[PDB]
Design a binder for this molecule. Structure first.
Ligand SMILES: Nc1ncnc2c1ncn2[C@H]1C[C@H](O)[C@@H](COP(=O)(O)O)O1
Ligand SMILES: Nc1ncnc2c1ncn2[C@H]1C[C@H](O)[C@@H](COP(=O)(O)O)O1
Lengths: 520, 61, 61
């Protein structure tokens, strides 16, 4: 598209309607972009002896980027409700990215007054990494996404990437990337940017919860025709009754003893924590007692491990040491905030397919029992994969991640984003943005010296993201009502999901996705 | 005398979905066929009763 | 008011006793409801009202 100065290069498209078979979410926000790194690429690295498991090496780029890898970027509270309460599952389909109404303001600090004006002849630069040649930095829960509330304005984040490193140093195999060596479209006021993307085939999310259990799958009325051993010694114990091999036919009575066809999902035990700050051990163990992995001799915390249940029945107070995603309430410092200032997510719908995160896995034998030796039991704390296991993945919440770029390696197992969502080989490419550097005043004499005197300026405009969603409708013959998400009809202070007395949108609680029931 | 098939549970993930007791793991296995004798009301009263009906003729098929 | 069924009772309930209980010992008041029957004819739930009105004075011939 190509138009003029006094002619808007786009309209405000923010709406969503339903097709019963699918739903299209249109979102528009206002963005602002500073000049990052002073038009410079900078080599960043770990502090000279400041930390060990946090060593790193990379670069800081003068470029910014757009992101909307949060569900609340597209769905409104209400829409999310309809979605959750009605559909077995859902998925992404298409994508439409649009940049418009661009304005480049240049600022000057004269005396003690900052004046801002229009630099019409100035441009901005956009390009999309569709060849996936730039390090994919999205899908890492970073901030700078689109505001949940449409009326809010946001600052466009800065691009920074990491590389292979040996402590504070780097290896010869490390990689340096210049985004200027990429063809980019430059835009003046009245120019716009267009982009269309098509999601790959990716399994529906589980907007459902099982009404049956793995162990409670059989028939309560009929007995099995299979036999198991339940008595090794205990006979008609009185005279001459040491031991005897006795077998029983499985019945509704021997419910946790019946033959089985399937196993629970894998596991990686997490430490149990209480929300009550006195049930816990009087010691600081959020690192020395937490489950972690290490690569290249570098410890890294296994935060959202395999999908495991948060708590067993009749507790609802013990959450796993970081066994789930925790969201911070609006207005709360990034450094050591209170327990009443965060929102911990409960994964208690997957109890029927998944092992409890804090609890064990089960029992394993590890000896040759006999008259000479007593049978030994081992408590299994870590279980790899097994032929016959079935599990449910995590959950997506209104403010959770949407997709994630599956790493390009030789092998993957069950490539679903650990933080939750859709694992994509080729995910919505990265869209870069940056203000074209404008040389300040040059000398009448020639200078070979690198240019570093520029006019200070920032850009602003609108951005629009349209996404189509395929839906999986609900087909259940459940007689009684199922559970639905709802607002408290009671007389209330402030309205859930709303601005306050001085204009600040706030998301009260996290929103699960599993409210509807399907069988096994 | 062993089992033949087994309905693979409808979850987010499976590994090697073969029935642990042995046989063929099926996403969509031979559906369940139900059967029942249609209830036959025994003798009713000449006066109307809102009470749930529980007097039936005993029969087998 | 005489539109319903003389034989069958309504499945709706109305309140007909506010105090009068097993009146003897410690029986001041109690909320008691009855199911409409052919017996409670002018007490049954209704779907319609009579026409408007503007009272006139009564005269005799
Ligand atoms: N989010 C997501 N993306 C892709 N595949 C998923 C996902 N979640 C579960 N799976 C399952 C579906 C396929 O049966 C299997 C392919 O693994 P492979 O290692 O590709 O053979 O992975
Ligand atoms: N009984 C039975 N049914 C189905 N598949 C079986 C069975 N036994 C072994 N397999 C193997 C065959 C496929 O390579 C794999 C698909 O696993 P998936 O998890 O589907 O990707 O599972």
């Amino acid at each position: 598209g190509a138009d003029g100065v006094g002619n808007s290069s786009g309209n405000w498209h923010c709406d969503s309607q339903w097709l019963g078979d699918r739903v299209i979410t249109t979102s528009t926000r206002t963005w602002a972009l500073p000049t990052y790194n002073n038009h410079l690429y900078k080599q960043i690295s770990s502090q000279s002896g400041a930390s060990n498991d946090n060593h790193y090496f990379g670069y800081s780029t003068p470029w910014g980027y757009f992101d909307f890898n949060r569900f609340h970027c597209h769905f409104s509270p209400r829409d999310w409700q309809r979605l959750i309460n009605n559909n077995w599952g859902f998925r992404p389909k298409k994508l439409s990215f649009k940049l418009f109404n661009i304005q480049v303001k240049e600022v000057t600090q004269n005396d003690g007054t900052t004046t801002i004006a229009n630099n019409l002849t100035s441009t901005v630069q956009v390009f999309t990494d569709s060849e996936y040649q730039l390090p994919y930095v999205l899908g890492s829960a970073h901030q700078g996404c689109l505001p949940p509330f449409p009326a809010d304005v946001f600052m466009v984040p800065q691009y920074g990437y990491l590389t292979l490193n040996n402590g504070s140093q780097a290896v010869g195999r490390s990689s340096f990337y210049c985004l200027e060596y990429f063809p980019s479209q430059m835009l003046r006021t009245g120019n716009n940017f267009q982009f269309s993307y098509t999601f790959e085939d990716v399994p529906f999310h589980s907007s459902y919860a099982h009404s049956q259990s793995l162990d409670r799958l059989m028939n309560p009325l009929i007995d099995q025709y299979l036999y198991y051993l339940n008595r090794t010694q205990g006979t008609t114990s009185g005279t001459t009754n040491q031991s005897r091999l006795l077998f029983s036919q499985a019945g509704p009575q021997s419910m946790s003893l019946q033959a089985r066809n399937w196993l629970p999902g894998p596991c990686y035990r997490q430490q149990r924590l209480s929300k009550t700050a006195n049930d816990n051990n009087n010691s600081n163990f959020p690192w020395t007692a937490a489950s972690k992995y290490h690569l290249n001799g570098r410890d890294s915390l296994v935060n959202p491990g395999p999908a495991m249940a948060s708590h067993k029945d009749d507790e609802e107070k013990f959450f796993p040491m970081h066994g789930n995603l925790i969201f911070g309430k609006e207005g709360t410092t990034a450094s050591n905030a209170e327990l009443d200032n965060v929102m911990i997510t409960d994964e208690e719908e997957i109890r029927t397919t998944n092992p409890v995160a804090t609890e064990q896995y089960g029992t394993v034998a590890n000896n040759l029992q006999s008259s000479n030796t007593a049978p030994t039991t081992r408590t299994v704390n870590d279980q790899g994969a097994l032929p016959g296991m079935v599990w449910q993945d995590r959950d997506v919440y209104l403010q959770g991640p949407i997709w994630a770029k599956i790493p390009h390696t030789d092998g993957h197992f069950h490539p679903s984003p650990l933080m939750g969502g859709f694992g994509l080989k080729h995910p919505p490419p990265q869209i870069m943005i940056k203000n074209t550097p404008v040389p300040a005043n040059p000398p009448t004499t020639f200078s070979p010296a690198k240019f570093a005197s520029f006019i200070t300026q920032y850009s602003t405009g609108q951005v629009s993201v349209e996404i189509e969603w395929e839906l999986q409708k609900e087909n259940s013959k459940r007689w009684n009502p199922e559970i639905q998400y709802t607002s408290n009809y009671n007389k209330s202070v402030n309205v859930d999901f709303t601005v306050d007395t001085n204009g600040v949108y706030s998301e009260p609680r996290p929103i699960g996705t599993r409210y509807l029931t399907r069988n096994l």
